[PDB]
Amino acid sequence: ATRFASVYAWNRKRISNCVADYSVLYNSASFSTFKCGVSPTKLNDLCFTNVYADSFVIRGDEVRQIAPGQTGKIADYNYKLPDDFTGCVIAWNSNNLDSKVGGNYNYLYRLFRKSNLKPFERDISTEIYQAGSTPCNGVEGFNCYFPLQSYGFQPTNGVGYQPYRVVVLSFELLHAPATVCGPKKSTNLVKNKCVNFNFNGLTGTGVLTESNKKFLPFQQFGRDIADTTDAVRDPQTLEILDIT
Amino acid sequence: NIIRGWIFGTTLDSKTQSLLIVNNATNVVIKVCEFQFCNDPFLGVNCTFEYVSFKNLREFVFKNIDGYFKIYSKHTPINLVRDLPQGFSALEPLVDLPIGINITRFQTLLALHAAYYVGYLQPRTFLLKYNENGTITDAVDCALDPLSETKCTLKSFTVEKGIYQTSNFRVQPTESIVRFPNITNLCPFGEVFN
Amino acid sequence: DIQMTQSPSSVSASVGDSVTITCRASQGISRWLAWYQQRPGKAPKLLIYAAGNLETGVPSRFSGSGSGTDFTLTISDLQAEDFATYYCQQADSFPLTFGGGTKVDIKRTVAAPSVFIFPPSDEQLKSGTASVVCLLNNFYPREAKVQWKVDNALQSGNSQESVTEQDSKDSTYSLSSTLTLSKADYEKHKVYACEVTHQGLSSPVTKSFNRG
Amino acid sequence: QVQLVESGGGLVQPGGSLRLSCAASGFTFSSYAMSWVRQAPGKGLEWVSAISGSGGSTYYADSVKGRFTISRDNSKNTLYLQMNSLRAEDTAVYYCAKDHLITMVQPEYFHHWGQGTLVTVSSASTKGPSVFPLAPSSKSTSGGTAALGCLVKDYFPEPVTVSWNSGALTSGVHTFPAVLQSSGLYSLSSVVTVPSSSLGTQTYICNVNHKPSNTKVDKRVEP
Ligand SMILES: *[C@@H]1O[C@H](CO)[C@@H](O[C@@H]2O[C@H](CO)[C@@H](O)[C@H](O)[C@H]2NC(C)=O)[C@H](O)[C@H]1NC(C)=O
């Protein structure tokens, strides 16, 4: 994405009903930090209800704050994760991108708030924080500070203060069809030889030969009198094969 | 082409996700958004899913199983003005939506400047005849009549002369009843409480 | 501090071709840039932002490239509506600075300028001001560089130029060079002339007239 | 997607002051940074002033600083730009620009553009145009076609309209864009090419109409 939203206004995107190859991102070696209760190593073989992507930009030193059971201004007032967080956290330097000559002050953070943020909560309130007992009257001043403080992102800032883009992927697993899995690799085809086959999860062993049986467009398998599988239709090419 | 749409749900007033199917011109629109439905929904002449692209009898079957909305259908040419034509034709699946919306009520959607029929389903046992090409050509309901039960038992559409055994006749326990001798030796709680 | 140069100033090309516009900032501006288009009589509209990110409504044939200092706007397919003025601005250092501006025209054959003379009228004589007009018609391209001579002497700071836009029937141009002076000064001299050197002309064309 | 409307421009005396206004609708005013950018009539764009989603930070161009003031109000959902010591170089079309992304301290890009209002500074007053003839030629030997026309001079303010016989002879007409004179007035040339055979035969009149001065004048040309 060209520009991210601020950390106090972290951008959430919903992903569902698609195929995600987590291996590609995992085999990218382009991010500074990549943490996952989920095992990163080849678990694009699992299905989930949804994938929620929370993206923002923070200084490098604050990057550590995005983890379960973490404290800090980002964790307390900008972006809070549940202690039972499921998913991964990814971060990579954006000093080449979010830094700017003269100071990049678009990205802000919430330093002042009445209370800490709940898990997965976003607070964009522009109400002046009332530090003391005097009402703020809609204007910042003594005992009344603007809740949003502006980062100065520059190419010369320290790495800990340098901008880092952070994206958090949360997997949803509820009582639902769970339509995002993301695996499904296939192989070639072999005929006229005793082999072990797996067609769309249907397993078996035998010899696959070309057939002349005329299936219906919506039907995939053929059965005999004894309920044994007899013919199949190749998912990658719509043709009928006899099993012996 | 007067019938054009369907609405399914439980409240159907934008308070919860109500499935909506609409046809317009050359386009089919399917959504699960919480649309604010009209009191008299028709067309003049939070979302989680969305898809966009008498002479005729069109049959449809709608059901829900394990969060999947299953839709079967069948089109056919007809020439009849009075009532439902009498005949047999199987229906093949077209749509399997992985949605998971609890649905209890529904309604149709018409276009105003075309009779239709409705029926409900039951858990029955059936016998089906697959032809050479794999098309269901005829069926038999088991629990319709004694002859039908006999056919279901023998797994045949032709029954030879004779006597067969089908089921077991029973009778029912009309009501419950309990007898215990009497109330005696009441524990004297009055002496303490009074 | 961040003054940027946009090239080429003005270009001409046919429908279906490709146009390349190169913008260079004085300092490295990372990816803080914006490429705009603007037709006469309308507000400018953004074509590219960041470095090569396209606008939603702009057709896909417009592309942006480059980074830091050099940047390039490429139009892969030219259309009749692609002839406008293009600009580049920076969005990283305040104050925000625009480019020189690039105008795109239609490529056509080079045509010789038809040059005509207009001495001040007798009605203009009573006013006390003399306006001598040299008219160029049906010339291409835009570059004409008209000059005035009085008694074979160069005149500077006394002439005003007004040029019509590119024509719609043959995509040509017209130019008016007016030499305005006082009646007393106009009466000092006897002969006036206007000269034009055009790429459609092998030799410069000078046209002269005498008062009376 | 949003609506931005600019107003307040006009014609004022040199050294005067003006107050332009930008009305913004369709989005929350406080979360976006406004900008005022002037474009000269014969020049390109150049940024002038910018405000930052509140009013705490005011940014000004190096040629407008010390005279102009930018302010914004969320309550009326609008922007104000006060211009002081207006000079002849302030005559330009002012545009109220906004960026698609929610920017609060800096404008950066300018994806939203308003209609813009013309601000003209001059010492001239309302006056009618003066029309003069420009004879076609005195030699029907060059190519058989001559160029004639009329000259409009010393009119203020813009514009003038030339009909050329009420639009009955439009073939070769060339009306050059209006140009500013050195005395605050303007000039125009309307030239047409006619065959040299039909010079003294066909009758032609150049008609010039001025609405601010309400002057409709007909002038004839004779070689
Ligand atoms: C699945 O993807 C394969 C890969 O392209 C598709 O196979 C192509 O099918 C078309 C027509 O059916 C042929 O013209 C191509 O030569 C095939 N390419 C290859 C590499 O096999 C296939 O159609 C897709 N769909 C299904 C259902 O298998």
> What stretches of A80-177 adopt beta strand conformation (E)?
87-93, 108-110, 129-130, 144-145, 148-150, 163-172
Residue minimizing CA distance to atom 22 of ligand 1: A236
How distant is the Cα of A56 from the closest Cα of chain D, in angstroms?
14
> CB–CB of A15/A51 below 8 Å?
yes
Cβ contact A–D (≥3 pairs, < 8 Å): yes
φ, ψ of residue A58 to 5 degrees: the values are: -140, 165
CA angle D138-D141-D147, nearest 5°?
55
**Residue type present at position B11:** T
CA distances to A67, A127, A128, C14 from A134, rounded to whole Å, are 36, 14, 11, 69
> CB–CB of A124/A7 below 8 Å?
no
Residue minimizing CA distance to atom 6 of ligand 1: A236
Best residue of D34, D99, D134 to probe chain C, by most C CBs closer than 10 Å: D134
Q: Do A106 and D105 touch (CB under 8 A)?
A: yes
C29 near A CB under 8 A: yes
CA distances to D48, D88, D93 from D60, rounded to whole Å, are 6, 19, 17
Report the distance separating Cα A242 and Cα A206, nearest Å: 10
- The radius of gyration computed from the CA coordinates of chain D, to the nearest angstrom, equals 24
Preceding amide of A40 cis, omega within 30:
no
HSE-up of residue C43 (Cα within 13 Å, Cβ side)? 21
Q: Do C162 and D151 touch (CB under 8 A)?
A: no
Judge residue C206's burial from the number of C-beta atoms within 10 Å of its C-beta, 0-12 exposed, 13-18 middle, 19 or more buried: middle
CA nearest to D170, candidates D190, D152, D188: D190
- CA of A43 from ligand 1 middle (Å) equals 27
Token code pair at residue D161: 């309209």
> CB–CB of C28/C51 below 8 Å?
no
Q: Do A3 and D101 touch (CB under 8 A)?
A: yes
Report the distance separating Cα C111 and Cα C16, nearest Å: 23
CB contacts of A156 in chain C (<8 Å) are none
CB contacts of C28 in chain A (<8 Å) are 101
> CB–CB of C132/C101 below 8 Å?
no
C49 near A CB under 8 A: yes
Report the distance separating Cα B107 and Cα A117, nearest Å: 43
Q: Which helix (H) or strand (E) holds B191?
A: helix B190-193
Q: Which helix (H) or strand (E) holds B128?
A: strand B126-130
CA distances to A105, A113, A148, A149, A195 from A108, rounded to whole Å, are 7, 14, 6, 5, 61
What resolution (Å)? 3.2
B68 near A CB under 8 A: yes
A225 near B CB under 8 A: no
CA distances to A8, B168, B174 from B171, rounded to whole Å, are 71, 10, 9
Query: Given phi > 0 = left and psi -120 to 50 = alpha, else beta, which region is C138?
Result: left
Among candidates A2, A97, A102 on the partner chain, residue whose Cβ is nearest the Cβ of C93: A102
> The tokens 């001065």 sit on which residue?
D213
C205: how many CB neighbours lie within 10 A of its CB?
17
Report the distance separating Cα D193 and Cα D148, nearest Å: 6
How distant is the Cα of C23 from the closest Cα of chain D, in angstroms?
15
> CB–CB of C51/C35 below 8 Å?
no
Report the distance separating Cα B58 and Cα B31, nearest Å: 22
Report the distance separating Cα D76 and Cα D95, nearest Å: 19
Output DSSP code: residue D89: G
Report the distance separating Cα A118 and Cα A138, nearest Å: 26
Report the distance separating Cα B93 and Cα C10, nearest Å: 63
Query: Given phi > 0 = left and psi -120 to 50 = alpha, else beta, which region is D144?
Result: left
- CA of A200 from ligand 1 middle (Å) equals 17
Query: SS3 sequence, C32-73?
Result: CEEEEEECCCCCCEEEEEECCEECCCCCCCEEEEEECCEEEE
**Which chain D residue has its CA at the smallest distance from C181's CA?**
D182
**Which chain B residue has its CA at the smallest distance from A223's CA?**
B134
> CB–CB of A77/A148 below 8 Å?
no
Token code pair at residue B36: 């604010």
Question: At D218, is the secondary structure helix, strand, or coil?
Answer: strand
Q: Do A106 and D30 touch (CB under 8 A)?
A: no
**Which chain A residue has its CA at the smallest distance from B68's CA?**
A177
Q: Do C162 and D177 touch (CB under 8 A)?
A: yes
**Which chain C residue has its CA at the smallest distance from D149's CA?**
C118
How distant is the Cα of C93 from the closest Cα of chain A, in angstroms?
6
Report the distance separating Cα C77 and Cα C60, nearest Å: 10
Residue numbers after which chain A is interrupted (C to N above 2.5 A) read 36
Q: Which residues make beta-bridge pairs with D3?
A: D25
Q: Do D132 and C85 touch (CB under 8 A)?
A: no
Q: Do A102 and C94 touch (CB under 8 A)?
A: yes
CB burial of A64-103 (b: ≥16 within 10 Å; e: otherwise) equals bbbeeebebbbbbbbbbbeeebebbbbbbbbbebbbbbeb
CB contacts of A5 in chain D (<8 Å) are 102
Among candidates B67, B92, B93 on the partner chain, residue whose Cβ is nearest the Cβ of A176: B67
Residues 6 or more apart whose Cβ sits within 8 Å of residue A201? none
A215 near B CB under 8 A: yes
- CA of A20 from ligand 1 middle (Å) equals 21
Cβ contact B–C (≥3 pairs, < 8 Å): no
- CA of A237 from ligand 1 middle (Å) equals 7
Nearest atom within ligand 1 for CA of residue A236:
28
Sheet containing strand C146-150, edge to edge, reads C146-150, C191-196, C205-210
* DSSP β-ladder status, C129-139 and B50-52: unpaired
Judge residue C22's burial from the number of C-beta atoms within 10 Å of its C-beta, 0-12 exposed, 13-18 middle, 19 or more buried: middle
Query: Given phi > 0 = left and psi -120 to 50 = alpha, else beta, which region is C123?
Result: alpha
Report the distance separating Cα D90 and Cα D79, nearest Å: 19
> CB–CB of B89/B72 below 8 Å?
no
CA nearest to A51, candidates A28, A8, A22, A31: A22
Residues 6 or more apart whose Cβ sits within 8 Å of residue A24? none
How does DSSP assign C58-123, residue by residue? S-TTEEEEEETTEEEEEESS--TT--SEEEEEESSSSSP-B---EEEE-----B--EEEEEPPPHH
Judge residue D99's burial from the number of C-beta atoms within 10 Å of its C-beta, 0-12 exposed, 13-18 middle, 19 or more buried: buried
Nearest atom within ligand 1 for CA of residue A237:
28
Residues 6 or more apart whose Cβ sits within 8 Å of residue D72? D29, D34, D51, D53, D54, D55, D78, D79, D80
Q: Do C92 and A101 touch (CB under 8 A)?
A: yes
Report the distance separating Cα D117 and Cα D98, nearest Å: 16
User: Does ligand 1 have an atom closer than 6 angstroms to the CB of A236?
Assistant: yes
Best residue of D102, D103, D109, D111 to probe chain A, by most A CBs closer than 10 Å: D102
Report the distance separating Cα D6 and Cα D98, nearest Å: 13
> CB–CB of B92/B134 below 8 Å?
no
Q: Do C53 and A2 touch (CB under 8 A)?
A: yes
- CA of D72 from ligand 1 middle (Å) equals 60
How distant is the Cα of C110 from the closest Cα of chain D, in angstroms?
19
Q: To 10 degrees, the CA torsion angle through C100, C106, C112, C117?
A: -60
φ, ψ of residue D105 to 5 degrees: the values are: -115, -30
φ, ψ of residue B177 to 5 degrees: the values are: -165, 140
CB contacts of A100 in chain C (<8 Å) are 30, 32, 92
User: Does ligand 1 have an atom closer than 6 angstroms to the CB of A237?
Assistant: yes
- The radius of gyration computed from the CA coordinates of chain B, to the nearest angstrom, equals 27
- CA of A233 from ligand 1 middle (Å) equals 14
φ, ψ of residue B97 to 5 degrees: the values are: -95, 120
How distant is the Cα of C76 from the closest Cα of chain A, in angstroms?
23
> CB–CB of A13/A53 below 8 Å?
yes
**Residue type present at position C200:** G
> CB–CB of B141/B42 below 8 Å?
no
Judge residue D200's burial from the number of C-beta atoms within 10 Å of its C-beta, 0-12 exposed, 13-18 middle, 19 or more buried: exposed
Residue minimizing CA distance to atom 25 of ligand 1: A236
> The tokens 């001598």 sit on which residue?
C132
CB contacts of A108 in chain D (<8 Å) are 104
- CA of A199 from ligand 1 middle (Å) equals 17
